[PDB]
Design a binder for this molecule. Structure first.
Ligand SMILES: [Zn+2]
Ligand SMILES: [Zn+2]
Length: 68
């Protein structure tokens, strides 16, 4: 919203919404600590199917820095 960005709990999703979506998830990087909407970062093999929810989730920052 304005100053609701905690150093350990910071919701940064592509939707720019720090609300309580279907399911939230925190980055697996202690140097990031960024929460994101699982549904937003979920890529199901099909539309309306079982999305792929991996054990370790890395935001865009970590994703690029990792080049995975
Ligand atoms: Zn989102
Ligand atoms: Zn991250």
């Amino acid at each position: 919203g304005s100053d609701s960005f905690q150093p350990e709990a910071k919701v940064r999703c592509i939707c720019s919404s720090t609300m309580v979506n279907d399911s939230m998830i925190q980055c697996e990087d202690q140097r990031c600590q960024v929460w994101q909407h699982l549904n937003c970062v979920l890529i199901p093999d099909k539309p309306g199917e079982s999305a792929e929810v991996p054990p370790v989730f890395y935001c865009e920052l970590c994703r690029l820095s990792r080049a995975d």
